[PDB]
Design a binder for this molecule. Structure first.
Ligand SMILES: OC[C@H]1O[C@H](O[C@H]2O[C@H](CO)[C@@H](O)[C@H](O)[C@H]2O)[C@H](O)[C@@H](O)[C@@H]1O
Ligand SMILES: OC[C@H]1O[C@H](O[C@H]2O[C@H](CO)[C@@H](O)[C@H](O)[C@H]2O)[C@H](O)[C@@H](O)[C@@H]1O
Ligand code: LU2
Ligand code: LU2
Ligand code: NA
Ligand code: NA
Lengths: 309, 307
């Protein structure tokens, strides 16, 4: 009944891209269709990796197979890490088509560009993707989940405070999407030093017809490791819970963040047991414990409340 | 914990191959790794389909990545439909090496060759695949799920009766596999014309060699479903894993799971198509996602009899 077209990476071993997004959305009842934009043995954080990349002509072929069977009717599109400009442009063309087929289609975009490590911001994708994201992808997106670095790149503005972040989210709203969620490890938290800040803003038209905006903030005590695939799972769960709670960004974000916390907590406890006391766990040991978190995906216990902005 | 390497087709829309096998095994708690041997828009029962095939060099490249990371430690391998002889030969090489890494690895093989339509056999794969299955795949496999037609092709004999099928299953056992399930047949059922027979045979140690043989008579729901054999092999893997000494219960849970999925699928297909209208392939896609709770704990709706 609720159809999602997810165009993301596939790995054999582990949970990133479509492997992070598909099982949880299926567990939540979505008819999610996975276009695998790469097929790799494992993610590129390992010592070794091999695989094959889907090119934009092949992506167009697969969409053509859907169109010919009148199977190009989706409720959502979901994208994330995209490596190639020609590929991103074909994704744009497909989303435009799908939005003409279904004007109510919701495009959820994780605009993966890069991140910051201890002051150095640096990108993960070719720099020539940024104009495509600015002029073609973000204007088409309805929900975007930039981290702070990508929100800065997309807006052209450095963020030094919650104030400036909220201004950047307004800037992002004006570029296209009605829902903007920024994640940041660099904004300060009154709760401590290992906290992640989530800022969410959603504009909607209420039953009376007025355009209003709900703004929220979460201060999350991180679990004591860094993982691969976290942003992919975040965007997938944000899709799921905004779908279930379309007019309640606070609840949507609380369920999203609580799902991630349960998965990551379980993952770090399993990784440390495999690694041993004091031993730094490997990337293999840090793979998200996705199938073991089924019950937390289905009904996450809320472990952090958002504050109203 | 329990890791499965599944080398099968991927489709964007629908449930065949790895799309039929992965979600249910994930729901049941297996760490299933999906090697997509093709990526097509949909299965070939539709009017159109587009996509790309994984070749044997690309399969080897993928496995090398796993091996370089010391990630080639699996508890199960699972395969089904393969069109390409060199690809199937690569799979055998990989399974051989995974068995060297883990001697207790269980290879579950659906030896997809063809099927009978009105008693008439017709084939799904090129002829040169049959020698590969007979001489390389089946000898390596530990659990196989041929239909009757495939059992006849692999063994070289016709099956006209239960007794003949069980003798053919014994020949398959002697070729390698300790578990053989003939998943559909033309055999008659006392329950009526609208039933098919499923027969299972498992060789195991109690520490003597003992045999368990079972039979089930299953009311065949009337529709052409795709991916049924893929789901059957995946759930046989799952339930023989949970019940290693009880083929009867493993088969009851497998068939019951299929029943719940297919029953839900035909109820939905008939509602979308309307009274009288034969449903389309798109309306008949397995309602996999909506069957999550039946997969988790299938209500037993069929009893197997121990032979
Ligand atoms: O829409 C189909 C089913 O969706 C719901 O159930 C799923 O989503 C829930 C959260 O919204 C999960 O808790 C649950 O585990 C999923 O199965 C709905 O509750 C079901 O009745 C529908 O069948
Ligand atoms: O081994 C991991 C889990 O496996 C079981 O749970 C799964 O399998 C059950 C059937 O064997 C399903 O009923 C259940 O929904 C699955 O989650 C086992 O019962 C659990 O304890 C394990 O965590
Ligand atoms: O909810 C959480 C959301 C995120 C997150 C979200 C988006 C990203 O692009 C990212 O890199 C991390 O990270 C977490 C890290 C945590 O340790 C705990 C958490 O709850 C979260
Ligand atoms: O358990 C069932 C198993 C299957 C089946 C299994 C393997 C195949 O290669 C195949 O072509 C069909 O077929 C069924 C058809 C049914 O209508 C109901 C069922 O329960 C089954
Ligand atoms: Na993100
Ligand atoms: Na079969």
């Amino acid at each position: 009944e609720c159809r999602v077209l997810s165009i993301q990476s596939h790995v054999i071993r582990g949970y990133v891209g479509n492997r992070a997004a598909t099982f949880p959305l299926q567990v939540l009842g979505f008819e999610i269709d996975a276009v695998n934009s790469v097929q790799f043995s494992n993610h590129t954080g390992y010592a070794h990796w091999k695989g094959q990349v889907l090119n934009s002509d092949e992506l167009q072929e697969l969409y053509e197979g859907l169109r010919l069977n009148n199977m190009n009717k989706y409720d959502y599109v979901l994208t994330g890490y995209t490596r190639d400009k020609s590929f991103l442009a074909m994704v744009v063309d497909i989303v435009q088509e799908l939005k003409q087929q279904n004007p109510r289609l919701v495009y959820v975009c994780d605009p993966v560009l890069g991140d910051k490590w201890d002051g150095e911001g640096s990108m993960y994708v070719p720099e020539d993707l940024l104009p495509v994201y600015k002029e073609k992808v973000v204007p088409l997106a309805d929900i975007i989940t930039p981290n702070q670095f990508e929100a800065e790149l997309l807006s052209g503005r450095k963020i030094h405070s919650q104030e400036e972040a909220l201004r950047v989210m307004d800037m992002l709203h004006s570029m296209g999407p009605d829902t903007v969620v920024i994640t940041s490890s660099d904004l300060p938290s009154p709760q401590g030093s290992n906290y992640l800040i989530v800022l969410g803003s959603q504009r909607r038209r209420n039953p009376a017809g007025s355009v209003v905006m709900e703004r929220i903030r979460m201060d999350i005590r991180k679990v004591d490791a860094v993982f691969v695939g976290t942003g992919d799972l975040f965007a997938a769960m944000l899709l799921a819970w905004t779908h279930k709670h379309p007019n309640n960004l606070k609840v949507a974000c609380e369920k999203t963040v609580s799902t991630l916390h349960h998965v990551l907590q379980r993952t770090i406890q399993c990784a440390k047991a495999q690694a041993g006391e004091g031993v730094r766990p490997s990337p293999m040991q840090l793979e998200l414990r996705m199938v073991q978190s089924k019950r937390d995906i289905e009904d996450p216990e809320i472990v952090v409340q958002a504050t109203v902005l």
